[PDB]
A paper describes a structure:
Serine hydroxymethyltransferase (SHMT), a ubiquitous pyridoxal-5′-phosphate (PLP)-dependent enzyme that catalyzes the interconversion of serine and tetrahydrofolate (THF) to glycine and 5,10-methylenetetrahydrofolate (MTHF), is one of the three enzymes in the dTMP cycle. Plasmodium falciparum serine hydroxymethyltransferase (PfSHMT), an enzyme in the dTMP synthesis cycle, is an antimalarial target because inhibition of its expression or function has been shown to be lethal to the parasite. Unlike hSHMT and rabbit SHMT (rSHMT), which exist as tetramers, the active form of PfSHMT is a homodimer with a molecular weight of about 85 kDa, similar to bacterial enzymes such as EcSHMT and Bacillus stearo­thermophilus (Bs) SHMT. Although the overall structure of PfSHMT is similar to those of other SHMTs, unique features including the presence of two loops and a distinctive cysteine pair formed by Cys125 and Cys364 in the tetrahydrofolate (THF) substrate binding pocket were identified.
As the wild-type enzyme could not be crystallized, protein engineering of residues on the surface was carried out. The surface-engineered mutant PfSHMT-F292E was successfully crystallized and its structure was determined at 3 Å resolution. The PfSHMT-F292E variant exhibited similar kinetic properties to those of the wild-type protein, indicating that the change to a hydrophilic residue only affected the surface properties and did not have a significant effect on the catalytic activity of the enzyme. The structure of PfSHMT was determined at 3 Å resolution in space group P61 with four protomers per asymmetric unit. The pyridoxal ring binds deeply in the pocket, with the C4A aldehyde of the pyridine ring forming a Schiff-base linkage to Lys237 N∊. Although the crystals of PfSHMT were grown from a solution of the enzyme in the presence of PLP and l-serine, the latter was not observed in the structure, likely owing to its high dissociation constant. Structural analysis of PfSHMT reveals a unique feature: Cys125 and Cys364 are present as a disulfide bond in one subunit and as cysteines with sulfhydryls in another subunit. A comparison of the local conformations of Cys125 and Cys364 in the four protomers showed that the Cα—Cα distances of the oxidized Cys364 from protomer A to the reduced states in the other three protomers are about 1.8–2.2 Å, while the Cys125 conformations are nearly identical. The presence of the disulfide bond in PfSHMT prevents the loop movement which is required for THF binding.
Residue numbers in the entry:
A (entry chain A): -5 to 442
B (entry chain B): -2 to 442
Amino acid sequence: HPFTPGMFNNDPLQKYDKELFDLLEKEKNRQIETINLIASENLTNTAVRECLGDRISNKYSEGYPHKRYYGGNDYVDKIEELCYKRALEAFNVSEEEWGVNVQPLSGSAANVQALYALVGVKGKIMGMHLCSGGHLTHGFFDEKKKVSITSDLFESKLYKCNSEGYVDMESVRNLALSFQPKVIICGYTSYPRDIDYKGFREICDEVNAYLFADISHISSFVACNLLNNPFTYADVVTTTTHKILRGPRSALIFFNKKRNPGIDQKINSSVFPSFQGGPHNNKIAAVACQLKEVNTPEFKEYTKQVLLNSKALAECLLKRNLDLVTNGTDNHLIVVDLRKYNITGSKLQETCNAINIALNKNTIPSDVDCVSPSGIRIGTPALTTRGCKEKDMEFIADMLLKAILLTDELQQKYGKKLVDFKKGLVNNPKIDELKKEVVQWAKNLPFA
Amino acid sequence: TPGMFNNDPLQKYDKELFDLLEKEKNRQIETINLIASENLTNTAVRECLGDRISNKYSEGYPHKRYYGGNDYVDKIEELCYKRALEAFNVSEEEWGVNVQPLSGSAANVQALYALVGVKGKIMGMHLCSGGHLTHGFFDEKKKVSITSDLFESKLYKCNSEGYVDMESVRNLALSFQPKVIICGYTSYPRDIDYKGFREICDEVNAYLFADISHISSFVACNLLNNPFTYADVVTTTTHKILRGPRSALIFFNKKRNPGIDQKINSSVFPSFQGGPHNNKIAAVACQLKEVNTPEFKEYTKQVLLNSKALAECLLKRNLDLVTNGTDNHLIVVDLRKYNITGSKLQETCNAINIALNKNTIPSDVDCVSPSGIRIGTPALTTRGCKEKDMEFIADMLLKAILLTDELQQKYGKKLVDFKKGLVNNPKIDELKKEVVQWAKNLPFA
Ligand SMILES: *Cc1c(COP(=O)(O)O)cnc(C)c1O
Ligand SMILES: *Cc1c(COP(=O)(O)O)cnc(C)c1O
């Protein structure tokens, strides 16, 4: 019948919206010429972005496969099922003992959700403090203000690292007896060592508690058997599919069924309908795409390289006498203790930003005040993806150091007020010279 | 020194997944979609969703970030703010917006939390009358939605005609003493008396909360009552009728309540979320530019004109509708006339490539064996359907309704049996063919 055109515009973003296209293309390029040392950032590849852009996100699909509110969910169903399967395979667990939910929109969501399923409203949860390397959704609150809902929706007590920066199993086991919570969370944001799960598993049993393991930072190591495996001990294991796993921004919630029969029911309800509506099927498709990469030799070889680059960088840094929290690293992350140079993480953070090196201020055990953090963290997953090898860590080390020394210098010339110091970065030529060296080093590396 | 990543295309890298995805696209092409909460994204939005900006962690707000390297992220979040306020014609001295909530349901738990806090009292419309799960909905078996557990909730209802009961809204409000009143709904075919609610709110010093997810595009284009003039918070999903990606927006009236900005913006982060999804913010920003064009006003017009057109055809064919018509993109048919269930017709229609969903009617007390169905015109409109085509749609439903009565008589009243009828049936095989040829024919974004 006589043609009437759709009411849409399928032209490219370049033609259709020049303003946005330009801003985005400036980001892709800023990315290329930056040395990304943010332990939680990574680069997605073609396949994953292709899924994220897939039309499958048109489909509303509240419910779980074969139990959906709307119809027309056969290919959605097959895809979510393929996702469960790749997820289980990726971590060597079996559908009999373990099940998984792939509908959470991010990690924080996965966490609140899995927590609530376990504990309910004003239930008792226990996790590591933030400044010591816990995540906000581990029950963080500070002073009067309950900062994370996990602190307000639940009763949360926080444990801490000792002075050497390790988790104090004794202090853990204490609070466990004292506060007596219903769930103990481990898995951490910025902890440079492996986690003693056997340990936590026992403390949990003494107190008859749930053992909750957040591997968002180190998911790939677990998968590749390069760290302890929490899946031996834990009742619930969640992870972001981004960061070290190099997938889309989404999350997983794995649950131990043999340890808690009908826990699946509890987890699923919390995700939908307690917390969420329709899933984001492109996220799901994208996550299935990456989990297949994960169960791969090339991905195993990438994971190990991340570990090898990190430890290599630690050597380089210790060789230059820098003081590292816990004095090394079992993983992709490292925290530098900066107080020896009379400089704050904050200051160094701005110095590195100004020379196209991205990292972030961190806390050393001895900073009681999270106000003025005295360290920084750095991670190798982004550089490793971009092809850096162990020998390439020498250069990173030399630069950080150069950056540390330039921080003291300006600090004094312009003052120890962040506002003042910050202005020493604006018109400095010693900074344009480092940025140049950096930008050229970075532009050269492969980019996904 | 080769990078340690495989940039191969999805076809090559993961043919299994690629296949399923393709099968998905063609299922969409060959389906007459009447699901009132589905639409189609266009090339640019999806380009944005795949954009690498998602690689970047932007915990915090523009110029208030934790990490450095957020210059363009900031430009873009701000651009999103700008195009957002602009889309709904409100002003940045009067109104603020938060573009970080990852979905509609999140936008709602966050906003609510920001306004009332733990165990605060909220009042919303009952699911079965068209309130969303996030509007405080609880069963008496369970607290189905977290919104019923984390907050104290009371559900209001609609009357036997299907209209919101303004007096019942106002009785419950005086008895309950809630701090937030929610209006804006999932399967309600008329416009909302925001002014009525603003009155019933003051009289109890509650916040008027408008969730305009289903009808967002109309409000923007002034084809429906504007909640902006009377509400304290407005939430919407940028998908559905607004046709953007899957994300949400919270809009807040500063002038009505100063310092509201901190409460909303803290609720989103760090109370609830973490790193935003910068692809999503981008694609929202992309789509809010389209909303503010003649072409998209011309679109919303058609969605509406097609809806009313379809209600006319259905009414001529003597179907019964809640409220006897629609003021928007949605229509709910009362199926009792045919002694048929929404489930059964849902099933019949899937079998013949027509998507639509069962919906309860004021007579019903349950979410199971509901007596009606819901249909909406946003997607067919996008695909270039006009008023003349609602006649095809109407006959086709009428056929389905008939074939449902028929199969019920033959195969049995229990759904399990009935589902059995739809398999290898040539009257169905034939309708499917009719529908596929028609649908396959239309534009597809
Ligand atoms: C980053 C992180 C999260 C939450 O990530 P989102 O940004 O909310 O997706 C949860 N747990 C850990 C350990 C994390 O590092
Ligand atoms: C669909 C809907 C929501 C929730 O959106 P999701 O993206 O599915 O979480 C909230 N409110 C209304 C009115 C809706 O129609």
